[PDB]
Design a protein around this ligand. Structure first.
Ligand SMILES: *[C@@H]1O[C@H](CO)[C@@H](O[C@@H]2O[C@H](CO)[C@@H](O[C@@H]3O[C@H](CO)[C@@H](O[C@@H]4O[C@H](CO)[C@@H](O)[C@H](O)[C@H]4NC(C)=O)[C@H](O)[C@H]3NC(C)=O)[C@H](O)[C@H]2NC(C)=O)[C@H](O)[C@H]1NC(C)=O
Ligand SMILES: *[C@@H]1O[C@H](CO)[C@@H](O[C@@H]2O[C@H](CO)[C@@H](O[C@@H]3O[C@H](CO)[C@@H](O)[C@H](O)[C@H]3NC(C)=O)[C@H](O)[C@H]2NC(C)=O)[C@H](O)[C@H]1NC(C)=O
Ligand SMILES: *[C@@H]1O[C@H](CO)[C@@H](O[C@@H]2O[C@H](CO)[C@@H](O)[C@H](O)[C@H]2NC(C)=O)[C@H](O)[C@H]1NC(C)=O
Ligand SMILES: *[C@@H]1O[C@H](CO)[C@@H](O[C@@H]2O[C@H](CO)[C@@H](O)[C@H](O)[C@H]2NC(C)=O)[C@H](O)[C@H]1NC(C)=O
Ligand SMILES: *[C@@H]1O[C@H](CO)[C@@H](O[C@@H]2O[C@H](CO)[C@@H](O)[C@H](O)[C@H]2NC(C)=O)[C@H](O)[C@H]1NC(C)=O
Ligand SMILES: *[C@@H]1O[C@H](CO)[C@@H](O)[C@H](O)[C@H]1NC(C)=O
Ligand SMILES: *[C@@H]1O[C@H](CO)[C@@H](O)[C@H](O)[C@H]1NC(C)=O
Ligand SMILES: [Ca+2]
Length: 948
């Protein structure tokens, strides 16, 4: 074991060699000088967040205002047209003409459309008319459906008017209480089809107000058998009808009432809680004697908690029995004396018990009685309770017409992530003279208009700011409407164990790394108020392997019209951006004919960022086709560009010109360098250049500058950054490309700190380990790790074979000791939008736990002794200056024959966090302030038992 002085000398020598090699081959100062000398082809412009966030908020508000105007127009026309209807009972000669979707009966005709291919949709559409979807188990050609089709045939004119007034308009849909949906533009529908309009989240949120559902399940002996599996399926289907604004709990009684799970009070009824409740209700067994009084007392006591967050709206008890003999007048009289709580009752299964008390309990408490004798009746009967809850909303009048917006969800017609604006439609036939009032207390249906998240993203440009900043909008529930980490895939729950109809609800604290200041900012945004806050965060890298600490500023404002709150995340060194200023065509050409694909042998292989410069250029991500399209467009277009913004074009041409001088004047002079296998440069303008042509196909980086992990990692740091290659044959790069090293250039025009681009090289691994040797020493091992504990240097030539691997996966004994002595800190997180292989009980959605390691303390020297039992191994470690590299030595693994379980840093599937103790102290949220219930003029004189 050598002393500390010699090891410090070796570390200093090799770190100076590496820094000098990188500074010379990359040419950081040469590019800095190139950027510094011109100062005339461009200018420096501020990035003042306070007006940027407000401008983006105003744009989002205007978009939502257009959508709300269209919704109001559609609702008004639908009400007016349905008011003047005749209800004809025959359709023999008066045929109904409509285009039925999902097609390749007497009473109606069929339309054959043209179906031209059109953009903004991933399918073939027709603007000539509207398509109609009728669920499979609903017969088209009956009197109800034919009358509905006839009176809804008049909505196509308003669909066309809305589309003409705003071409950038997606689906417009009328969802009927009959069951059909008429949507525009007409498209063919997407095995068997189980789509039902009345089960959709937008229809459900528009059909009533939030609720406080409580489900009583009878688990006595008489429900054993098929009337128990039907009860379980019905409870699951009814839980499927709730949302994040509704609060639910499930209780079961057999001579004694108790909660079926760990909750013990109403919960937010989100994905995790609903999954827990479904799992709990799947585990109930039937035994005992029914006692309605105890179960109803439990249910009534559960709705008077008020110590927990609730909806403070519709309070309903949803009883699931077969048939009893007790009416329990005392419990109903005692608890809801004034009938402030509704009681819906369900009789499940095929049996011969008495249904009288069930119907009486439904009728005496503003409720409704339903019969579910088979599986086929489960879906319809578990969604009809929204008709009863909608009576106070229709009786409210025009005050109960407010455009609401759903959570982010995947469109049924394969359009991506969308939100839906919603407006209910009322039945007002005979309300001109105000005489019917009998069936006019139910809604006709729901208006819907879809807004894709790409439309919202188009209103928040990000190319005028560094790849680190971004925008994000937050729901008053804490979910993110817009975020870089949000993905177009359903969020996972638990672990998929087997023998996308849910909303994509991702919380703000789950999209990025949580912090004590993140919670404060999120709470300040949820209630709604402008503000700004600068602080120092620890940020995860684009690839989930690194964490680095950097300064950030969050500037947030509320959107006026809606309840979303929009915030901009902007780091330092990005308050100023380079804006190209040039109107001379000669320099534009001298820059443009640099990017010729057949002229890369001397200019290096060039990659273009597939940015949407304008509509004429269509991205392809091949970057060979796209580069040819780009330079053909540049060489074949006049600079007028009627609908093609040149600011991106100006920036990319200016950066191409800068890179041309960087490559020709400096890189070309030294064609070959010993310890270099590739030299690369990436810029914010949207290009990268790799000098070796043979390294062009080994450049496994995304062409877009803003999506490169190493770019942002180098921006955050102020020193050279190493990147460990991926492990276990993920292609080329382990031995044939080398270790990638990057460094970001800093520019001072008027003293402002600017980072327009990054440079870097790829050290040849063979020459680098050869310089390291000056090998196979069985006495001691000497390795180099990066910030993250990934292997970069080895000594035994077997570890060298497996490079770019986590240190703990091969030598956990010393990795755990390093973590213990606080030389590496680590943080874990949950990824909910991940797919994985299932397990014993294709790939499915799951929650995966991720771990990331980073430097703990600012100290640079460490030494100590590891006691692994019956041995004692001394170890030393020094962090290389002006980089993120550490050199550590210890005795060989053979000296002490101990090997504990290996420390894995990877995508570990899990199911955390536990929701039983998560609901004890829930996150802050704000609920809607509009509640419609207990209207005095409610009829409520009809249940499901009097008619049947
Ligand atoms: C909006 O509300 C209005 C009223 O507020 C509503 O208009 C009413 O529609 C019903 C149809 O459901 C009309 O009922 C008429 O009278 C009976 C009752 O259904 C029908 O005769 C048979 O009734 C049995 C039910 O026992 C039924 O099974 C059978 O199919 C019916 N027909 C037969 C046997 O041939 C009449 O056919 C029916 N229609 C007539 C007489 O033209 C009410 O008269 C309507 N009320 C008013 C004031 O117009 C309207 O439907 C609601 N909107 C929507 C979208 O439903
Ligand atoms: C529900 O279905 C009804 C029958 O299919 C539709 O009623 C028909 O509408 C036609 C045009 O809208 C009418 O044609 C003309 O109507 C005017 C109105 O006063 C009159 O000049 C004549 O009745 C007629 N003119 C002619 C034949 O030259 C039909 O008379 C009328 N009734 C029928 C066919 O029995 C409804 O329009 C439809 N509802 C909706 C909302 O579309
Ligand atoms: C919370 O709910 C409980 C019952 O669910 C309410 O009742 C009190 O609970 C606390 C707990 O020790 C004690 O004060 C008494 O046992 C209960 N009665 C009274 C009169 O306090 C309680 O009031 C609710 N609110 C709070 C803040 O606990
Ligand atoms: C992420 O960063 C570190 C990872 O170890 C942890 O933060 C530390 O939390 C303790 C708890 O009291 C504090 O005393 C330290 O000062 C924190 N370190 C800092 C702020 O650098 C933790 O795992 C994560 N930090 C969070 C969740 O705030
Ligand atoms: C939302 O509306 C409020 C008020 O309606 C806007 O508040 C403005 O605030 C600035 C400075 O704080 C004032 O100079 C304006 O006069 C206020 N507006 C009005 C109408 O008085 C707020 O800016 C709006 N939100 C956004 C994002 O613009
Ligand atoms: C629609 O919204 C945009 C902002 O996104 C606004 O400029 C425009 O005036 C609105 N109306 C129409 C008809 O485009
Ligand atoms: C990837 O998994 C292990 C991890 O080191 C590796 O040894 C193995 O060779 C790789 N899998 C295959 C099929 O080669
Ligand atoms: Ca019983």
């Amino acid at each position: 074991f050598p002393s500390a002085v010699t090891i410090k000398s070796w570390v200093d020598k090799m770190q100076e060699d590496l820094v000098t090699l990188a500074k010379t081959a990359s040419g950081v100062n040469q590019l800095v000088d190139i950027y510094e000398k011109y100062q005339d082809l461009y200018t420096v412009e501020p990035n003042n967040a306070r007006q940027l966030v407000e401008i983006a908020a105003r744009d989002i508000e205007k978009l939502l205002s257009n959508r709300s105007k269209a919704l109001v127009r559609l609702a008004l026309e639908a009400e007016k047209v349905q008011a003047a209807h005749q209800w004809r009972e025959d359709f023999a000669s008066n045929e109904v003409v409509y285009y039925n979707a999902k097609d390749d009966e007497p009473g109606s005709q069929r339309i054959k459309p043209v179906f031209i291919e059109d953009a903004n949709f991933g399918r073939q559409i027709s603007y000539q008319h509207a398509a109609v979807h009728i669920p499979t188990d609903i017969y088209e050609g009956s009197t109800i459906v034919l009358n509905e089709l006839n009176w809804t045939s008049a909505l196509d004119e308003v669909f066309k008017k809305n589309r003409e007034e705003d071409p950038s308009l997606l689906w417009q849909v009328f969802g009927s209480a009959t069951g059909l949906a008429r949507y525009y533009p007409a498209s063919p529908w997407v095995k068997i089809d189980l789509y039902d309009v009345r089960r959709r989240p937008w229809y459900i949120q528009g059909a009533a107000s939030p609720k406080d559902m409580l489900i009583l399940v009878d688990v006595s002996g008489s429900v054993s058998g098929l009337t128990l599996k039907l009860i379980r399926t019905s409870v699951s289907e009814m839980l499927e009808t709730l949302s994040d604004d509704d609060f639910v709990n499930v209780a079961s009684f057999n001579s004694n009432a108790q909660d079926v799970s760990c909750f013990q009070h109403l919960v937010q009824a989100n994905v995790r809680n609903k999954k827990v409740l479904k799992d709990a209700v799947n585990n109930i067994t039937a035994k005992g004697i029914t006692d309605y009084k105890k179960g109803f007392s439990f249910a009534f006591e559960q709705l008077l908690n008020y110590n927990v967050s609730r909806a403070n709206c519709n309070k309903i008890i949803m009883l699931f029995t077969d048939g009893g003999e007790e009416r329990a007048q005392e419990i109903f009289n005692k608890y809801n004396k004034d009938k402030k709580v509704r009681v819906f009752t369900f009789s499940v299964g095929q049996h011969n018990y008495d249904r009288g008390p069930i119907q009486w309990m439904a009728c005496e408490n503003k409720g409704y009685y339903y019969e579910i004798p088979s599986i086929g009746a489960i879906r319809i009967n578990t969604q009809e309770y929204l008709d009863v809850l909608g009576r106070p909303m229709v009786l409210a009048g025009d005050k109960a017409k407010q455009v609401q917006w759903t959570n982010v969800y995947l469109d049924a017609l394969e359009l991506g992530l969308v939100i839906t604006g919603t407006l209910p439609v009322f039945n007002i036939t005979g309300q001109f003279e105000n005489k019917t009032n009998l069936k006019n207390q139910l809604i006709l249906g729901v208006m819907g208009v879809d807004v894709s998240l790409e439309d919202i993203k188009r209103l928040t440009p990000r190319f005028t700011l560094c790849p680190n900043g971004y925008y994000f909008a937050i729901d008053p529930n804490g979910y993110v409407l817009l975020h870089p980490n949000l993905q177009p895939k359903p969020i996972g729950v638990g672990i998929p164990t087997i023998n996308s109809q849910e909303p994509v609800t991702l919380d703000f604290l789950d999209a990025e790394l949580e912090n004590d200041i993140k919670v404060e900012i999120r709470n300040k945004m949820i209630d709604g108020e402008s503000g700004e806050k600068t602080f120092r965060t620890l940020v995860k890298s684009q690839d989930e392997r690194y964490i680095d600490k950097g300064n950030r500023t969050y500037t947030w404002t509320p959107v006026n019209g809606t309840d979303y709150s929009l915030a901009l995340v902007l780091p330092t060194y990005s308050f100023y951006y380079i804006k190209a200023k040039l109107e001379e065509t000669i320099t534009q050409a001298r820059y443009s004919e640099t990017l010729k694909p057949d002229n890369f042998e001397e200019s290096g292989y060039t990659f273009i960022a597939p940015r949407d410069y304008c509509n004429d250029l269509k991205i392809s991500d091949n970057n060979t086709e796209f580069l040819l399209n780009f330079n053909e467009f540049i060489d074949r277009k006049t600079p007028n560009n009627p609908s093609c913004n040149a600011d991106l074009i100006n920036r990319v041409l200016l950066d191409a010109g800068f890179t041309n001088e960087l490559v020709q004047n400096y890189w070309s002079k030294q064609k070959n360098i010993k310890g270099v296998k590739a030299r690369f440069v990436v810029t914010d303008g949207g290009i990268t250049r790799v000098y070796p042509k043979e390294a062009g196909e080994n450049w496994q980086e995304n062409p877009e500058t803003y999506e490169d992990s190493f770019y942002k990692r180098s921006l955050d740091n102020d020193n050279y950054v190493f990147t460990a290659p991926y492990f276990n044959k993920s292609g080329p790069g382990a031995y044939e490309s080398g270790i990638m090293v990057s460094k970001a250039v800093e520019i001072y025009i008027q003293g402002k700190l600017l980072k327009p681009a990054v440079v870097g090289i790829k050290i040849d691994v063979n020459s680098w380990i050869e310089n390291f040797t000056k090998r196979n020493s069985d006495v001691m091992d000497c390795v180099i790790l990066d910030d993250g504990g990934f292997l970069l240097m080895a000594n035994h030539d077997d570890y060298t074979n497996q490079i770019g691997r986590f240190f703990g996966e091969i030598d956990p004994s010393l990795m755990r000791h390093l973590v213990n002595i606080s030389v590496y800190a680590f943080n874990k997180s949950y990824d909910y939008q991940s797919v994985c292989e299932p397990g014993a009980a294709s790939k499915q959605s799951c929650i995966t736990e991720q771990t990331q390691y980073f430097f703990d303390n600012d100290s640079k020297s460490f030494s100590g002794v590891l006691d692994c039992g019956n041995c004692s191994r001394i170890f030393h470690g020094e962090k290389l200056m002006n980089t993120n590299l550490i050199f550590i030595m210890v005795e060989s693994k053979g000296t002490c024959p101990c090997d504990t379980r290996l420390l894995i840093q990877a995508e570990q599937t899990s199911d955390g966090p536990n929701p039983c103790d998560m609901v004890k102290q829930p996150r802050y949220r704000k609920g809607p302030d509009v509640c419609f219930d207990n209207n005095v003029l409610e009829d409520y004189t009809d249940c499901g038992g009097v008619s049947g």
